[PDB]
Amino acid sequence: STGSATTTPIDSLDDAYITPVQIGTPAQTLNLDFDTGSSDLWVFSSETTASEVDGQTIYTPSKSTTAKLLSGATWSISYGDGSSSSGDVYTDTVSVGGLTVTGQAVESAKKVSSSFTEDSTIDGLLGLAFSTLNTVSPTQQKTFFDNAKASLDSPVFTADLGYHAPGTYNFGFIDTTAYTGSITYTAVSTKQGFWEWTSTGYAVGSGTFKSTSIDGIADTGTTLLYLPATVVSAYWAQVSGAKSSSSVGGYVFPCSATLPSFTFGVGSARIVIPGDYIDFGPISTGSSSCFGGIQSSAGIGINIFGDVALKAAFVVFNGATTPTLGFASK
Ligand SMILES: Cc1ccc(-c2noc([C@H]3C[C@@H](O)CN3)n2)cc1F
């Protein structure tokens, strides 16, 4: 089997991407944030505290004839930005772009943090990291990809995120028309439950490539590119007037600047992020100071190849017995 679904930026800045998902019988379609950095499928629901719902589409398990309460199961998760959600668990039928999983754990939110409440366009998350990270207690549950992959034509999914434009998540096949040149595959460590890999280095603009190992994760659920402070300093030094701001919380730059590209290495291959992918617009409405899309990972503990990097590539998440990651230019 295979599946294919369009993913869409939630706003003009590509702050995140939503993908329609069919849950239950009859189908309840919710727009979920596909997140290769976590492993919970959770949704706004009829159980979510009323005051914490503001515009989201909710899942109502009582109206699904295939929904079953998972007795005694709860979940609770916190994301890298301090955001959180929690609730109970159902099993139900879940379909993505024509690919169907029966008995998928659907985690129904009772509580969500303010950031989720304030984003009316995101109805929940669909985790695509490794199932070892799933938070359901006392019995851990499997991800959508994990449940589907034995049925897939090939145990893979691909992320093809667009710059200010729609893109595609495919399951079970590689669309050879979606990229240029070849796909370069690189080793993955699953020891922390992430799609963790090691970049071979970077360049800034037309500058010479610096060969250096950068361990990080491929994370569709993170907006920006987070890299070591040395690397990030080298990038923003090439932008006149750019500075790291304490009050703002990272590098900002004059909105009139022309941003240089950023290149990262995948083995001997090179993925080039165009400079305008790194522009995240005025820090506040009407400001001439803009937020940078490359930021330091120093306070995080790990480097994160978020959407800023991934959207410059066609990315293969290969879930064979020994998982690997593939990158192609497009
Ligand atoms: C309001 C909001 C906040 C965070 C997230 C979010 N989704 O994926 C992630 C990254 C960071 C780490 O969790 C691994 N994946 N963060 C989504 C939101 F809609």
mmCIF file with all atom_site columns, C-alpha atoms in Angstrom, residues 47-249:
data_model
loop_
_atom_site.group_PDB
_atom_site.id
_atom_site.type_symbol
_atom_site.label_atom_id
_atom_site.label_alt_id
_atom_site.label_comp_id
_atom_site.label_asym_id
_atom_site.label_entity_id
_atom_site.label_seq_id
_atom_site.pdbx_PDB_ins_code
_atom_site.Cartn_x
_atom_site.Cartn_y
_atom_site.Cartn_z
_atom_site.occupancy
_atom_site.B_iso_or_equiv
_atom_site.pdbx_formal_charge
_atom_site.auth_seq_id
_atom_site.auth_comp_id
_atom_site.auth_asym_id
_atom_site.auth_atom_id
_atom_site.pdbx_PDB_model_num
ATOM 1   C CA . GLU A 1 47  ? -12.896 16.331 25.910  1.00 0.00 ? 47  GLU A CA 1
ATOM 2   C CA . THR A 1 48  ? -10.586 19.354 25.677  1.00 0.00 ? 48  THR A CA 1
ATOM 3   C CA . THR A 1 49  ? -11.298 22.048 28.291  1.00 0.00 ? 49  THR A CA 1
ATOM 4   C CA . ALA A 1 50  ? -13.654 24.508 26.568  1.00 0.00 ? 50  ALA A CA 1
ATOM 5   C CA . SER A 1 51  ? -11.574 27.571 27.413  1.00 0.00 ? 51  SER A CA 1
ATOM 6   C CA . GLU A 1 52  ? -8.523  25.964 25.798  1.00 0.00 ? 52  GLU A CA 1
ATOM 7   C CA . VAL A 1 53  ? -10.208 25.502 22.421  1.00 0.00 ? 53  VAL A CA 1
ATOM 8   C CA . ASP A 1 54  ? -10.228 28.521 20.103  1.00 0.00 ? 54  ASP A CA 1
ATOM 9   C CA . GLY A 1 55  ? -11.136 27.672 16.515  1.00 0.00 ? 55  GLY A CA 1
ATOM 10  C CA . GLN A 1 56  ? -9.674  24.162 16.194  1.00 0.00 ? 56  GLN A CA 1
ATOM 11  C CA . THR A 1 57  ? -11.553 21.246 14.658  1.00 0.00 ? 57  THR A CA 1
ATOM 12  C CA . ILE A 1 58  ? -12.204 18.640 17.354  1.00 0.00 ? 58  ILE A CA 1
ATOM 13  C CA . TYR A 1 59  ? -12.341 14.846 17.340  1.00 0.00 ? 59  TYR A CA 1
ATOM 14  C CA . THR A 1 60  ? -15.496 13.509 18.996  1.00 0.00 ? 60  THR A CA 1
ATOM 15  C CA . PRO A 1 61  ? -14.919 9.828  19.798  1.00 0.00 ? 61  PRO A CA 1
ATOM 16  C CA . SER A 1 62  ? -18.542 9.270  20.885  1.00 0.00 ? 62  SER A CA 1
ATOM 17  C CA . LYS A 1 63  ? -19.547 9.899  17.254  1.00 0.00 ? 63  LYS A CA 1
ATOM 18  C CA . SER A 1 64  ? -17.094 7.338  15.871  1.00 0.00 ? 64  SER A CA 1
ATOM 19  C CA . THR A 1 65  ? -18.488 3.817  15.731  1.00 0.00 ? 65  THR A CA 1
ATOM 20  C CA . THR A 1 66  ? -14.949 2.454  15.515  1.00 0.00 ? 66  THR A CA 1
ATOM 21  C CA . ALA A 1 67  ? -13.555 4.406  18.497  1.00 0.00 ? 67  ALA A CA 1
ATOM 22  C CA . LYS A 1 68  ? -12.764 2.433  21.653  1.00 0.00 ? 68  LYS A CA 1
ATOM 23  C CA . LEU A 1 69  ? -11.575 3.900  24.936  1.00 0.00 ? 69  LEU A CA 1
ATOM 24  C CA . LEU A 1 70  ? -8.206  2.474  25.900  1.00 0.00 ? 70  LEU A CA 1
ATOM 25  C CA . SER A 1 71  ? -8.924  1.610  29.514  1.00 0.00 ? 71  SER A CA 1
ATOM 26  C CA . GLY A 1 72  ? -6.684  3.360  32.042  1.00 0.00 ? 72  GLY A CA 1
ATOM 27  C CA . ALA A 1 73  ? -4.384  4.869  29.417  1.00 0.00 ? 73  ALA A CA 1
ATOM 28  C CA . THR A 1 74  ? -3.254  8.489  29.719  1.00 0.00 ? 74  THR A CA 1
ATOM 29  C CA . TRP A 1 75  ? -0.694  10.668 27.952  1.00 0.00 ? 75  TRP A CA 1
ATOM 30  C CA . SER A 1 76  ? 1.207   13.848 28.688  1.00 0.00 ? 76  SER A CA 1
ATOM 31  C CA . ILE A 1 77  ? 3.859   15.479 26.574  1.00 0.00 ? 77  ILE A CA 1
ATOM 32  C CA . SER A 1 78  ? 6.018   18.587 26.584  1.00 0.00 ? 78  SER A CA 1
ATOM 33  C CA . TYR A 1 79  ? 7.653   19.962 23.452  1.00 0.00 ? 79  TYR A CA 1
ATOM 34  C CA . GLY A 1 80  ? 10.960  21.781 22.989  1.00 0.00 ? 80  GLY A CA 1
ATOM 35  C CA . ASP A 1 81  ? 9.383   25.231 23.296  1.00 0.00 ? 81  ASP A CA 1
ATOM 36  C CA . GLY A 1 82  ? 7.671   24.602 26.623  1.00 0.00 ? 82  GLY A CA 1
ATOM 37  C CA . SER A 1 83  ? 4.319   23.796 25.044  1.00 0.00 ? 83  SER A CA 1
ATOM 38  C CA . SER A 1 84  ? 2.363   20.836 26.428  1.00 0.00 ? 84  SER A CA 1
ATOM 39  C CA . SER A 1 85  ? -0.785  18.749 26.193  1.00 0.00 ? 85  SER A CA 1
ATOM 40  C CA . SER A 1 86  ? -2.331  15.750 27.941  1.00 0.00 ? 86  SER A CA 1
ATOM 41  C CA . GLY A 1 87  ? -5.397  13.536 28.069  1.00 0.00 ? 87  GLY A CA 1
ATOM 42  C CA . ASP A 1 88  ? -6.718  10.021 27.563  1.00 0.00 ? 88  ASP A CA 1
ATOM 43  C CA . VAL A 1 89  ? -6.465  7.545  24.703  1.00 0.00 ? 89  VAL A CA 1
ATOM 44  C CA . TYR A 1 90  ? -8.750  5.920  22.166  1.00 0.00 ? 90  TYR A CA 1
ATOM 45  C CA . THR A 1 91  ? -8.010  3.462  19.416  1.00 0.00 ? 91  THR A CA 1
ATOM 46  C CA . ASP A 1 92  ? -9.603  4.272  16.066  1.00 0.00 ? 92  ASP A CA 1
ATOM 47  C CA . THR A 1 93  ? -9.207  4.052  12.296  1.00 0.00 ? 93  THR A CA 1
ATOM 48  C CA . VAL A 1 94  ? -6.803  6.665  10.915  1.00 0.00 ? 94  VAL A CA 1
ATOM 49  C CA . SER A 1 95  ? -6.164  7.422  7.235   1.00 0.00 ? 95  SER A CA 1
ATOM 50  C CA . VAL A 1 96  ? -3.586  9.666  5.600   1.00 0.00 ? 96  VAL A CA 1
ATOM 51  C CA . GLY A 1 97  ? -3.868  10.332 1.876   1.00 0.00 ? 97  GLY A CA 1
ATOM 52  C CA . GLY A 1 98  ? -5.458  6.969  1.122   1.00 0.00 ? 98  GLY A CA 1
ATOM 53  C CA . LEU A 1 99  ? -3.349  4.904  3.537   1.00 0.00 ? 99  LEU A CA 1
ATOM 54  C CA . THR A 1 100 ? -5.391  3.358  6.348   1.00 0.00 ? 100 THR A CA 1
ATOM 55  C CA . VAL A 1 101 ? -4.426  2.063  9.791   1.00 0.00 ? 101 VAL A CA 1
ATOM 56  C CA . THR A 1 102 ? -6.974  0.328  12.006  1.00 0.00 ? 102 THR A CA 1
ATOM 57  C CA . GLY A 1 103 ? -6.509  0.378  15.784  1.00 0.00 ? 103 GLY A CA 1
ATOM 58  C CA . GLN A 1 104 ? -4.294  3.460  15.800  1.00 0.00 ? 104 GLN A CA 1
ATOM 59  C CA . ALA A 1 105 ? -3.819  5.105  19.183  1.00 0.00 ? 105 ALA A CA 1
ATOM 60  C CA . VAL A 1 106 ? -5.535  8.497  18.995  1.00 0.00 ? 106 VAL A CA 1
ATOM 61  C CA . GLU A 1 107 ? -4.625  10.557 22.028  1.00 0.00 ? 107 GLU A CA 1
ATOM 62  C CA . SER A 1 108 ? -7.518  12.833 22.990  1.00 0.00 ? 108 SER A CA 1
ATOM 63  C CA . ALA A 1 109 ? -6.446  16.079 24.673  1.00 0.00 ? 109 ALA A CA 1
ATOM 64  C CA . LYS A 1 110 ? -8.083  17.104 27.951  1.00 0.00 ? 110 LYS A CA 1
ATOM 65  C CA . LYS A 1 111 ? -5.622  19.967 28.365  1.00 0.00 ? 111 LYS A CA 1
ATOM 66  C CA . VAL A 1 112 ? -3.431  21.946 25.982  1.00 0.00 ? 112 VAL A CA 1
ATOM 67  C CA . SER A 1 113 ? -1.034  24.799 26.708  1.00 0.00 ? 113 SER A CA 1
ATOM 68  C CA . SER A 1 114 ? -1.702  28.349 25.548  1.00 0.00 ? 114 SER A CA 1
ATOM 69  C CA . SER A 1 115 ? 0.433   28.127 22.399  1.00 0.00 ? 115 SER A CA 1
ATOM 70  C CA . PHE A 1 116 ? -1.769  25.338 21.044  1.00 0.00 ? 116 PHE A CA 1
ATOM 71  C CA . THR A 1 117 ? -4.964  27.186 21.997  1.00 0.00 ? 117 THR A CA 1
ATOM 72  C CA . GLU A 1 118 ? -3.696  30.289 20.177  1.00 0.00 ? 118 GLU A CA 1
ATOM 73  C CA . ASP A 1 119 ? -2.967  28.438 16.933  1.00 0.00 ? 119 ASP A CA 1
ATOM 74  C CA . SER A 1 120 ? -6.416  27.850 15.463  1.00 0.00 ? 120 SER A CA 1
ATOM 75  C CA . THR A 1 121 ? -4.978  26.143 12.355  1.00 0.00 ? 121 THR A CA 1
ATOM 76  C CA . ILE A 1 122 ? -3.426  23.151 14.123  1.00 0.00 ? 122 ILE A CA 1
ATOM 77  C CA . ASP A 1 123 ? -5.882  20.489 15.256  1.00 0.00 ? 123 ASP A CA 1
ATOM 78  C CA . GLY A 1 124 ? -3.222  18.246 16.757  1.00 0.00 ? 124 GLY A CA 1
ATOM 79  C CA . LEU A 1 125 ? 0.036   16.446 16.059  1.00 0.00 ? 125 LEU A CA 1
ATOM 80  C CA . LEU A 1 126 ? 0.954   13.254 14.233  1.00 0.00 ? 126 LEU A CA 1
ATOM 81  C CA . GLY A 1 127 ? 4.308   11.971 15.472  1.00 0.00 ? 127 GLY A CA 1
ATOM 82  C CA . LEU A 1 128 ? 6.711   10.260 13.082  1.00 0.00 ? 128 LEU A CA 1
ATOM 83  C CA . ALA A 1 129 ? 9.774   9.737  15.270  1.00 0.00 ? 129 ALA A CA 1
ATOM 84  C CA . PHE A 1 130 ? 10.475  6.320  16.770  1.00 0.00 ? 130 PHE A CA 1
ATOM 85  C CA . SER A 1 131 ? 7.808   4.679  18.923  1.00 0.00 ? 131 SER A CA 1
ATOM 86  C CA . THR A 1 132 ? 10.198  4.495  21.899  1.00 0.00 ? 132 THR A CA 1
ATOM 87  C CA . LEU A 1 133 ? 9.336   8.170  22.512  1.00 0.00 ? 133 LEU A CA 1
ATOM 88  C CA . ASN A 1 134 ? 5.551   7.629  22.792  1.00 0.00 ? 134 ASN A CA 1
ATOM 89  C CA . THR A 1 135 ? 4.190   8.950  26.101  1.00 0.00 ? 135 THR A CA 1
ATOM 90  C CA . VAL A 1 136 ? 1.082   6.775  26.578  1.00 0.00 ? 136 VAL A CA 1
ATOM 91  C CA . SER A 1 137 ? 1.067   5.250  30.068  1.00 0.00 ? 137 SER A CA 1
ATOM 92  C CA . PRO A 1 138 ? 0.988   2.602  31.452  1.00 0.00 ? 138 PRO A CA 1
ATOM 93  C CA . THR A 1 139 ? 1.210   0.932  28.016  1.00 0.00 ? 139 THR A CA 1
ATOM 94  C CA . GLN A 1 140 ? 3.276   2.738  25.320  1.00 0.00 ? 140 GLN A CA 1
ATOM 95  C CA . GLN A 1 141 ? 1.657   2.977  21.858  1.00 0.00 ? 141 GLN A CA 1
ATOM 96  C CA . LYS A 1 142 ? 2.938   2.863  18.268  1.00 0.00 ? 142 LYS A CA 1
ATOM 97  C CA . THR A 1 143 ? 3.117   5.677  15.717  1.00 0.00 ? 143 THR A CA 1
ATOM 98  C CA . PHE A 1 144 ? 1.055   5.799  12.548  1.00 0.00 ? 144 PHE A CA 1
ATOM 99  C CA . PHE A 1 145 ? 4.134   4.971  10.447  1.00 0.00 ? 145 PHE A CA 1
ATOM 100 C CA . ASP A 1 146 ? 5.099   2.073  12.730  1.00 0.00 ? 146 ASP A CA 1
ATOM 101 C CA . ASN A 1 147 ? 1.595   0.595  12.453  1.00 0.00 ? 147 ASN A CA 1
ATOM 102 C CA . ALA A 1 148 ? 1.513   1.024  8.678   1.00 0.00 ? 148 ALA A CA 1
ATOM 103 C CA . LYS A 1 149 ? 4.994   0.107  7.607   1.00 0.00 ? 149 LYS A CA 1
ATOM 104 C CA . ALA A 1 150 ? 4.667   -3.675 7.271   1.00 0.00 ? 150 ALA A CA 1
ATOM 105 C CA . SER A 1 151 ? 1.812   -3.029 4.824   1.00 0.00 ? 151 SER A CA 1
ATOM 106 C CA . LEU A 1 152 ? 3.672   -0.380 2.833   1.00 0.00 ? 152 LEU A CA 1
ATOM 107 C CA . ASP A 1 153 ? 5.195   -1.180 -0.556  1.00 0.00 ? 153 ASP A CA 1
ATOM 108 C CA . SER A 1 154 ? 8.457   0.021  0.992   1.00 0.00 ? 154 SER A CA 1
ATOM 109 C CA . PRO A 1 155 ? 8.979   0.865  4.687   1.00 0.00 ? 155 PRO A CA 1
ATOM 110 C CA . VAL A 1 156 ? 9.560   4.566  4.048   1.00 0.00 ? 156 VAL A CA 1
ATOM 111 C CA . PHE A 1 157 ? 7.959   7.950  4.125   1.00 0.00 ? 157 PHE A CA 1
ATOM 112 C CA . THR A 1 158 ? 9.114   11.156 2.470   1.00 0.00 ? 158 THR A CA 1
ATOM 113 C CA . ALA A 1 159 ? 8.830   14.834 3.392   1.00 0.00 ? 159 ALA A CA 1
ATOM 114 C CA . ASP A 1 160 ? 8.705   17.382 0.585   1.00 0.00 ? 160 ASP A CA 1
ATOM 115 C CA . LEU A 1 161 ? 7.960   20.690 2.270   1.00 0.00 ? 161 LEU A CA 1
ATOM 116 C CA . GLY A 1 162 ? 7.379   23.775 0.180   1.00 0.00 ? 162 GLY A CA 1
ATOM 117 C CA . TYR A 1 163 ? 8.778   27.272 0.584   1.00 0.00 ? 163 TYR A CA 1
ATOM 118 C CA . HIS A 1 164 ? 5.715   29.505 0.946   1.00 0.00 ? 164 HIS A CA 1
ATOM 119 C CA . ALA A 1 165 ? 3.862   26.779 -0.973  1.00 0.00 ? 165 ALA A CA 1
ATOM 120 C CA . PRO A 1 166 ? 2.170   23.405 -0.525  1.00 0.00 ? 166 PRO A CA 1
ATOM 121 C CA . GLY A 1 167 ? 4.163   20.199 -0.392  1.00 0.00 ? 167 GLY A CA 1
ATOM 122 C CA . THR A 1 168 ? 3.732   16.472 0.050   1.00 0.00 ? 168 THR A CA 1
ATOM 123 C CA . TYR A 1 169 ? 4.085   13.646 2.545   1.00 0.00 ? 169 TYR A CA 1
ATOM 124 C CA . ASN A 1 170 ? 4.264   10.250 0.839   1.00 0.00 ? 170 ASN A CA 1
ATOM 125 C CA . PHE A 1 171 ? 4.112   6.846  2.545   1.00 0.00 ? 171 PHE A CA 1
ATOM 126 C CA . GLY A 1 172 ? 5.471   3.628  1.058   1.00 0.00 ? 172 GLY A CA 1
ATOM 127 C CA . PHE A 1 173 ? 7.124   4.954  -2.097  1.00 0.00 ? 173 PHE A CA 1
ATOM 128 C CA . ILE A 1 174 ? 9.712   7.387  -3.434  1.00 0.00 ? 174 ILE A CA 1
ATOM 129 C CA . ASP A 1 175 ? 8.495   9.792  -6.124  1.00 0.00 ? 175 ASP A CA 1
ATOM 130 C CA . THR A 1 176 ? 11.499  9.993  -8.428  1.00 0.00 ? 176 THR A CA 1
ATOM 131 C CA . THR A 1 177 ? 9.981   13.006 -10.186 1.00 0.00 ? 177 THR A CA 1
ATOM 132 C CA . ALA A 1 178 ? 10.025  15.088 -6.979  1.00 0.00 ? 178 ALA A CA 1
ATOM 133 C CA . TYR A 1 179 ? 13.752  15.814 -6.843  1.00 0.00 ? 179 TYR A CA 1
ATOM 134 C CA . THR A 1 180 ? 16.794  16.519 -8.981  1.00 0.00 ? 180 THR A CA 1
ATOM 135 C CA . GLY A 1 181 ? 20.022  14.527 -9.106  1.00 0.00 ? 181 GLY A CA 1
ATOM 136 C CA . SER A 1 182 ? 20.376  11.627 -6.683  1.00 0.00 ? 182 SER A CA 1
ATOM 137 C CA . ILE A 1 183 ? 19.296  10.887 -3.138  1.00 0.00 ? 183 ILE A CA 1
ATOM 138 C CA . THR A 1 184 ? 22.228  10.736 -0.734  1.00 0.00 ? 184 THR A CA 1
ATOM 139 C CA . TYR A 1 185 ? 21.606  8.399  2.182   1.00 0.00 ? 185 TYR A CA 1
ATOM 140 C CA . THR A 1 186 ? 23.251  8.884  5.552   1.00 0.00 ? 186 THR A CA 1
ATOM 141 C CA . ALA A 1 187 ? 23.363  6.864  8.776   1.00 0.00 ? 187 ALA A CA 1
ATOM 142 C CA . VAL A 1 188 ? 20.765  7.301  11.512  1.00 0.00 ? 188 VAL A CA 1
ATOM 143 C CA . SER A 1 189 ? 21.073  6.778  15.241  1.00 0.00 ? 189 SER A CA 1
ATOM 144 C CA . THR A 1 190 ? 17.823  5.857  16.980  1.00 0.00 ? 190 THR A CA 1
ATOM 145 C CA . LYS A 1 191 ? 19.347  5.874  20.445  1.00 0.00 ? 191 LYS A CA 1
ATOM 146 C CA . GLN A 1 192 ? 17.443  8.955  21.522  1.00 0.00 ? 192 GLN A CA 1
ATOM 147 C CA . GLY A 1 193 ? 14.330  8.008  19.543  1.00 0.00 ? 193 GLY A CA 1
ATOM 148 C CA . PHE A 1 194 ? 14.920  10.667 16.880  1.00 0.00 ? 194 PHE A CA 1
ATOM 149 C CA . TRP A 1 195 ? 15.863  10.651 13.207  1.00 0.00 ? 195 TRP A CA 1
ATOM 150 C CA . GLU A 1 196 ? 19.368  11.608 14.326  1.00 0.00 ? 196 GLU A CA 1
ATOM 151 C CA . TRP A 1 197 ? 22.183  11.967 11.823  1.00 0.00 ? 197 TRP A CA 1
ATOM 152 C CA . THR A 1 198 ? 25.519  13.714 11.285  1.00 0.00 ? 198 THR A CA 1
ATOM 153 C CA . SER A 1 199 ? 25.939  16.484 8.757   1.00 0.00 ? 199 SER A CA 1
ATOM 154 C CA . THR A 1 200 ? 29.395  16.670 7.208   1.00 0.00 ? 200 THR A CA 1
ATOM 155 C CA . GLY A 1 201 ? 29.610  20.475 7.407   1.00 0.00 ? 201 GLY A CA 1
ATOM 156 C CA . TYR A 1 202 ? 28.427  23.806 6.055   1.00 0.00 ? 202 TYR A CA 1
ATOM 157 C CA . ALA A 1 203 ? 29.052  26.857 3.921   1.00 0.00 ? 203 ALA A CA 1
ATOM 158 C CA . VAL A 1 204 ? 27.753  30.417 4.158   1.00 0.00 ? 204 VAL A CA 1
ATOM 159 C CA . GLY A 1 205 ? 26.771  32.007 0.853   1.00 0.00 ? 205 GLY A CA 1
ATOM 160 C CA . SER A 1 206 ? 29.499  31.524 -1.760  1.00 0.00 ? 206 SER A CA 1
ATOM 161 C CA . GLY A 1 207 ? 32.075  30.848 0.964   1.00 0.00 ? 207 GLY A CA 1
ATOM 162 C CA . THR A 1 208 ? 34.302  27.788 1.236   1.00 0.00 ? 208 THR A CA 1
ATOM 163 C CA . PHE A 1 209 ? 32.751  24.636 2.675   1.00 0.00 ? 209 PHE A CA 1
ATOM 164 C CA . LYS A 1 210 ? 33.774  23.860 6.251   1.00 0.00 ? 210 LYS A CA 1
ATOM 165 C CA . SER A 1 211 ? 34.127  20.128 6.884   1.00 0.00 ? 211 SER A CA 1
ATOM 166 C CA . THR A 1 212 ? 32.940  19.493 10.423  1.00 0.00 ? 212 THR A CA 1
ATOM 167 C CA . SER A 1 213 ? 30.612  16.975 12.042  1.00 0.00 ? 213 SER A CA 1
ATOM 168 C CA . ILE A 1 214 ? 27.241  18.324 13.117  1.00 0.00 ? 214 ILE A CA 1
ATOM 169 C CA . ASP A 1 215 ? 25.058  15.833 14.959  1.00 0.00 ? 215 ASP A CA 1
ATOM 170 C CA . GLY A 1 216 ? 21.395  16.779 14.743  1.00 0.00 ? 216 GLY A CA 1
ATOM 171 C CA . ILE A 1 217 ? 17.857  15.623 14.144  1.00 0.00 ? 217 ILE A CA 1
ATOM 172 C CA . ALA A 1 218 ? 15.583  15.830 11.111  1.00 0.00 ? 218 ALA A CA 1
ATOM 173 C CA . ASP A 1 219 ? 12.535  17.459 12.685  1.00 0.00 ? 219 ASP A CA 1
ATOM 174 C CA . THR A 1 220 ? 9.559   18.518 10.571  1.00 0.00 ? 220 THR A CA 1
ATOM 175 C CA . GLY A 1 221 ? 7.877   19.766 13.751  1.00 0.00 ? 221 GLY A CA 1
ATOM 176 C CA . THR A 1 222 ? 10.458  22.497 14.347  1.00 0.00 ? 222 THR A CA 1
ATOM 177 C CA . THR A 1 223 ? 10.229  25.691 12.272  1.00 0.00 ? 223 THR A CA 1
ATOM 178 C CA . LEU A 1 224 ? 13.809  26.896 12.324  1.00 0.00 ? 224 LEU A CA 1
ATOM 179 C CA . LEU A 1 225 ? 17.346  25.610 11.819  1.00 0.00 ? 225 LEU A CA 1
ATOM 180 C CA . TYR A 1 226 ? 19.239  25.310 15.132  1.00 0.00 ? 226 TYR A CA 1
ATOM 181 C CA . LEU A 1 227 ? 22.988  24.875 14.865  1.00 0.00 ? 227 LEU A CA 1
ATOM 182 C CA . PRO A 1 228 ? 26.091  25.337 17.036  1.00 0.00 ? 228 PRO A CA 1
ATOM 183 C CA . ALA A 1 229 ? 26.846  28.893 18.181  1.00 0.00 ? 229 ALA A CA 1
ATOM 184 C CA . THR A 1 230 ? 30.079  28.991 16.180  1.00 0.00 ? 230 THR A CA 1
ATOM 185 C CA . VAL A 1 231 ? 28.242  28.105 12.968  1.00 0.00 ? 231 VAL A CA 1
ATOM 186 C CA . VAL A 1 232 ? 25.363  30.508 13.592  1.00 0.00 ? 232 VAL A CA 1
ATOM 187 C CA . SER A 1 233 ? 27.776  33.335 14.360  1.00 0.00 ? 233 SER A CA 1
ATOM 188 C CA . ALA A 1 234 ? 29.600  32.641 11.091  1.00 0.00 ? 234 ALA A CA 1
ATOM 189 C CA . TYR A 1 235 ? 26.312  32.887 9.197   1.00 0.00 ? 235 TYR A CA 1
ATOM 190 C CA . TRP A 1 236 ? 24.997  36.103 10.713  1.00 0.00 ? 236 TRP A CA 1
ATOM 191 C CA . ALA A 1 237 ? 28.401  37.810 10.456  1.00 0.00 ? 237 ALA A CA 1
ATOM 192 C CA . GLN A 1 238 ? 27.681  37.888 6.703   1.00 0.00 ? 238 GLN A CA 1
ATOM 193 C CA . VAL A 1 239 ? 24.510  39.930 7.226   1.00 0.00 ? 239 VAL A CA 1
ATOM 194 C CA . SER A 1 240 ? 25.116  43.642 7.728   1.00 0.00 ? 240 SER A CA 1
ATOM 195 C CA . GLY A 1 241 ? 23.507  44.847 10.943  1.00 0.00 ? 241 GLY A CA 1
ATOM 196 C CA . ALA A 1 242 ? 22.445  41.410 12.179  1.00 0.00 ? 242 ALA A CA 1
ATOM 197 C CA . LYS A 1 243 ? 22.783  40.935 15.944  1.00 0.00 ? 243 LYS A CA 1
ATOM 198 C CA . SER A 1 244 ? 21.845  38.460 18.630  1.00 0.00 ? 244 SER A CA 1
ATOM 199 C CA . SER A 1 245 ? 19.148  40.029 20.784  1.00 0.00 ? 245 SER A CA 1
ATOM 200 C CA . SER A 1 246 ? 18.515  39.001 24.396  1.00 0.00 ? 246 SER A CA 1
ATOM 201 C CA . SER A 1 247 ? 15.088  40.619 24.579  1.00 0.00 ? 247 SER A CA 1
ATOM 202 C CA . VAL A 1 248 ? 13.943  39.029 21.315  1.00 0.00 ? 248 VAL A CA 1
ATOM 203 C CA . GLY A 1 249 ? 15.616  35.676 22.008  1.00 0.00 ? 249 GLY A CA 1
#
